[PDB]
């Protein structure tokens, strides 16, 4: 039907791609390949090279100068695009030979296969002070040529391309997570009990999520408030491992429970970007150049492998806490609250026959 393409400043190279978003199925990964047109007389060095590469890149230390970002090469792969090599004796997709015929016998192919369990596309919410380039996980490829591998980049004679490493929600349904907890107190042996339940474990962006909570008050004291929490968890790994979370939304129910009684109710919350622009570092799906991508989808792990992957990983959990009236011989000295939380998933389905376009409402 149609394809993308780009050309070099030197007016001698042209690239062609079938898609920019590539799917990871956890159990496997999509292959990537394509063809490039070249100008023979424009080159006499007898060597041409290209290199797909993945790395984690972002502001290095405090380097304010544009483009000064740390470059951690999580994966690198390269090929001498031309002249051909005996390692290229592998089959090709039909569309490739079709494009060769469409172009003639003066273009050469390229192919790569991703090793599973690499960090997926992600970006960190850049605040107004973050006027520099974006920070996040990137997958990119570049085209070039030279007479000796020691040769470095050349501005007029190079071009780079970017892609996204994404995934789609598993089709099969998952379990319904639910949890209960018990709390005892030291002057009355009638312990508190609690329970919360959800509808399902997967959800779509913009779709409300509802929770059902049961209350078991067995003691003299009384519940005063109930906090509703939905917190994003961010996994960080550049030099070592680190963990911290940010809340996207929350609510504090005003319900109260009389001594030695029980109660139940249901609550609903909806995450959305508008109420969270100001916050730095929010988990955002991989942008292309400047698109206002929605919140980052939860990153499913590499199945049961549970390897010590590098890069960034994200998930979400809902939590609830109870405020209990102080009193007795304790006063402000002791602690009173109880809480419980459950995990879940939030993510887009697999596109049917059309992956998302680039900011349809162009303005």
């Amino acid at each position, epitope marked *: 039907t149609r394809v993308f393409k780009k050309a070099s400043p030197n007016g001698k190279l042209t690239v062609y791609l079938g898609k920019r978003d590539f799917v990871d199925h956890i159990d496997l990964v999509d292959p990537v390949d394509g063809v490039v047109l070249v100008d023979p007389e424009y080159l006499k060095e007898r060597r041409v090279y290209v290199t797909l590469t993945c790395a984690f890149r972002y502001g290095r230390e405090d380097l304010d100068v544009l483009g000064l970002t740390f470059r951690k090469d999580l994966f690198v792969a390269n090929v001498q695009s031309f002249p051909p090599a005996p390692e290229d004796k592998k089959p090709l997709t039909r569309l490739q030979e079709r494009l060769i015929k469409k172009l003639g016998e003066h273009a050469y192919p390229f192919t790569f296969e991703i090793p599973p369990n690499l960090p997926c596309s992600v970006t960190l919410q850049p605040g107004p002070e973050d006027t520099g380039k974006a920070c996040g996980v990137d997958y990119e490829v570049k085209a070039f040529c030279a007479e000796n591998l020691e040769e470095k980049i050349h501005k007029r004679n190079s071009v780079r391309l970017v892609i996204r490493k994404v995934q789609y929600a598993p089709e099969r349904p998952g379990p319904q997570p639910t949890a209960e907890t018990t709390r005892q107190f030291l002057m009355s042996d009638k312990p508190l009990h609690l329970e919360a339940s959800l509808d399902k474990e997967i959800y779509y962006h*913009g779709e409300p999520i509802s929770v059902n909570v049961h209350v078991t008050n067995n003691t003299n004291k009384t519940v005063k408030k109930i906090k509703i929490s939905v917190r994003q968890y961010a996994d960080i790994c550049l030099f070592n491992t680190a963990q911290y979370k940010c809340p996207v939304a929350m609510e504090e129910a005003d319900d109260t429970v009389a001594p030695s009684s029980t109660f139940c109710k249901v609550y609903t919350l909806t995450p959305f970007l508008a109420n969270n622009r100001e916050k730095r570092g929010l988990a955002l799906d991989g942008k292309l150049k400047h698109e206002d991508t*929605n919140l980052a989808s939860s990153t499913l792990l590499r199945e049961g492998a549970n390897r010590e992957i590098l890069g960034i990983i994200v998930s979400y959990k809902v939590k609830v806490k109870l405020v209990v009236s102080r009193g007795g011989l304790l006063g402000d000295l002791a602690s009173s609250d109880v809480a419980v939380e459950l995990p879940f998933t939030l993510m887009h389905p697999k596109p049917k026959e059309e992956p*998302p376009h680039r900011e349809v*409402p162009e303005s």
Partner: antibody
Amino acid sequence: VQLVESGGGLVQPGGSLRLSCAASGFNVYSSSIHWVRQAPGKGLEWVASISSYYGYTYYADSVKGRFTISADTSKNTAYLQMNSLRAEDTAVYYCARSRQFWYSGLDYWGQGTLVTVS
Amino acid sequence: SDIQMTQSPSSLSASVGDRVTITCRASQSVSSAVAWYQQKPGKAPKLLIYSASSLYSGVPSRFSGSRSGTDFTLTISSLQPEDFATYYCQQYKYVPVTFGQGTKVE
């Protein structure tokens, strides 16, 4: 699932009303809304739209400023702000909804509404 | 600048079963961010084709359309009596969004 709209009628020029469009089954964040008018015997012309998830608003220059939209998540309904009304603006207005992820068409359309002046 | 859109022919009269095409073109490239719409007198519009080729659920096969460079076309392989209605070519690549004048069947 259907959408119901109301808030128009017969007036004299200058004033304005609050046309409304009520949703059902799905929240605003799940989608985005637009508005279109049809002059008698003429085609269709986009007038306004709302992006609740992103919070942007967009309006035709023909009505920029003099028209605005409002809505509430809990109410599951939107209201049409406008002022400085021209009698020649009399047209048949329609409410419709499109997916936020991702805009590719308009599936649901309301019964429409009309305005007029004497 | 908005998308100045031209669509023709305006309308056609003929017998049932014949193939008739409606064409559409724009002032600038729109890749494939185009759609077509239908409406009947006193009734709300209806979506027919999106992404310039995609067929909506429940559409009989005879509905068809295709892209040709910066020119666009919708067509029915063989018409039926119930198909007498109004049709519109529609773009969505840029704001302000713009429609065509429409189409007629007779």
